[PDB]
């Protein structure tokens, strides 16, 4: 059970034989004198004083009509002396901003993985995730309040199910003091933010996920020590969870037997489909520099909720070049399923900031992402902070006048879909908002009023986007094997054009093509590999989504035509700053 602290320590409800109450347990082996205040107490350590456990370190004491609802701290004096009052680690729900209160409840019943969320993380699906940060996706009207997790799982989750999006990722939903931190700045790791009602309207919320067919992956921060309210810091009088700014003493059992099992909660007890960790680098660093504990951590805590719930996977942020990140532990290390291909984000929009006319001096940033995919499982993100403390939304860093601007944008989209590696795209970037993300307000959903706008067009690309990666294997089945990607034309610098296939298990193979110029391209022939009819199944050009409409009119047969030295070609019209993609037709 130490892989499940929370099921034993805490508060949970009980019966000395026919008599009950709640029991509580605390781990603060050093302490000296720790009990139990709350409403049932009248709030008076001095009436219920806990009986402690050196074989275990661990305190408790069982309480008659103590039931849930009601609020409590525990009071205890420093291993130094100290009288000090400290919120329940393992609360389940808190009570954040008043005078900061554990609220006694359960454990949420128990989730059980399905045979369809497991399959949806596997390597082989397609996973196209839709990055949301509850507290601003979405605003009431006048009040500007916050939607609850009962009015986001009626509006969030079908939205995010139309848009075509496989997977939900939450910014941390860890119970946190300050709405600026977005949730990565914790003081209650096992209760779910108060900020939109109560653990098991949350609980209600990720059922409302699964029912449409949606993954919920969670951002998990088990990176970040707690550093507000004392919440975490000398428990028990001396350095109980934290190193002698503050981190974790992974090292210590039990503050791994808290992270590790937390990880064990959500997923089972809340039917989290996948943990993200941000700032893995920060954890590793800061073996002369490396943190050897933490980076052994990470390796276990994959291990483990790799044996305990197989279904469930785990991704994870690392700003260095850490080798291995999503790599077997028994060699490299880690072991995490997927990583964020921040490199790839950092190459693709420097190129996109470039002026069309200039691009023909840095091809390789498009070309390069290639030579390092099979180094990770990659998910090529589009985040929350790219857009903001002035790196500007999406949208604003493309070059040009209004048309241009979309154009790329779409173009851009058009290429990131179809190249290797899973899709996340952060709430806004979908309806290429103009502005800046900002976690205190909702998301300029006004763009999108009346009037069928370029706004509309990009949030329609997007979700044709989402449908037309699934359903077609080639370009989703093998991003990590180089049998599923393959160059048509990786040198066509000077005109800004590159082309490739993409191919699933079966040998079928789509033409991805992009005009990175609004410079149209007609009776532009490059070789091919399965010679017939092709034809497009994505046009960023399209008048829908508000492009030129320039493109290839259905169905255009190959030529033996010698060229990229291939024997037979096609000959196309490459739209202005677009991409298409085309497939065969059987005859």
């Known amino acids: 059970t130490h892989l499940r602290p929370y099921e034993t320590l805490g508060a949970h409800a009980d019966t000395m034989d026919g008599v009950t109450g709640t029991r509580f347990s605390v781990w603060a082996p050093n302490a000296r004198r720790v009990s139990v205040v709350g409403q049932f107490n009248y709030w008076d350590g001095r009436r219920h004083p806990m009986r402690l456990r050196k074989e275990s370190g661990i305190w408790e004491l069982f309480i008659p009509g ?41 454990l949420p019943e128990k989730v059980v993985q399905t045979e369809e969320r497991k399959k949806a993380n596997q390597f082989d699906a397609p996973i196209s995730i839709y990055e949301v940060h509850l507290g601003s996706w979405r605003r009431h009207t006048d009040n500007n309040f916050w939607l609850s997790y009962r009015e986001l799982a009626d509006q969030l989750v079908p939205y995010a199910k139309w848009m075509g999006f496989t997977h939900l990722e939450l910014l941390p939903i860890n119970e946190h003091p300050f709405d600026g931190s977005w949730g990565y700045q914790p003081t209650g790791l096992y209760a779910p933010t108060r900020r939109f009602g109560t653990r098991d309207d949350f609980r209600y919320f990720i059922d409302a996920a699964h029912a449409a067919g949606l993954n919920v992956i969670l951002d998990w921060v088990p990176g970040h020590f707690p550093t507000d309210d004392f919440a975490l810091a000398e428990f028990d ?125 840095h091809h390789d940033k498009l070309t390069f992402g290639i030579l390092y995919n099979y180094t990770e499982n990659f998910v090529l993100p589009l985040s929350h902070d790219e857009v903001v403390h002035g790196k500007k939304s999406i949208l604003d860093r493309m070059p040009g006048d209004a048309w241009q601007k979309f154009a790329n944008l779409r173009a851009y989209y058009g290429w990131m879909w179809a190249f290797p590696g899973k899709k996340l795209l952060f709430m806004g970037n979908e309806f290429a908002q103009g502005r800046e993300w900002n976690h205190d307000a909702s998301l300029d959903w006004h763009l999108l009023e009346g009037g069928d706008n370029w706004h509309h067009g990009v949030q329609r690309l997007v979700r044709d986007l989402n449908l037309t990666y699934r359903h077609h294997k080639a370009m989703h089945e093998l991003d990590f094997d180089p049998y599923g990607f393959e160059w048509l034309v990786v040198d066509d610098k000077e005109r800004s054009v590159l082309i490739f296939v993409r191919r699933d298990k079966e040998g079928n193979e789509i033409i991805v093509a992009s005009n990175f110029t609004p410079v149209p391209r007609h009776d532009y022939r490059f070789g091919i590999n399965q010679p017939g009819k092709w034809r497009e199944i994505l046009n960023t050009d399209s008048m829908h989504y508000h492009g030129s409409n320039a493109g290839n009119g259905g169905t255009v047969h190959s030529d033996e035509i010698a060229s990229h030295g291939r024997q037979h070609s096609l000959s196309l019209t490459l739209p202005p700053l677009a991409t298409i993609w085309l497939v065969r037709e059987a005859e």
């Open 66 to 106: 103590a039931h849930n609802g009601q609020l409590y701290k525990y009071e205890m004096i420093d291993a130094n002396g100290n009288l000090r009052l400290k919120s329940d680690p393992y609360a389940f729900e808190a009570q954040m901003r008043p005078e900061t209160a554990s609220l006694i409840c359960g």
């Open 237 to 361: 009088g001396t350095n109980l969870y934290e190193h002698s700014t503050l981190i974790y003493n992974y090292g210590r059992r039990e503050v791994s037997n808290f992270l590790v099992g937390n990880a064990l909660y959500w997923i089972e007890r809340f039917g989290i489909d996948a943990l993200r960790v941000d700032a893995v680098a920060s954890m590793i660093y800061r073996g002369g520099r490396e943190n050897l504990e933490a980076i052994e951590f990470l390796r276990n805590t994959n291990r483990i909720l790799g044996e305990q719930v197989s279904g469930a996977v785990t991704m994870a942020e690392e700003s260095t070049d850490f080798p291995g990140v999503s790599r077997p532990q028994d060699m490299g290390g880690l072991g995490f399923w997927y990583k964020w291909n921040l490199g790839w984000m950092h190459d693709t929009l420097d190129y996109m900031k470039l002026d069309p006319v200039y691009r023909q001096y």
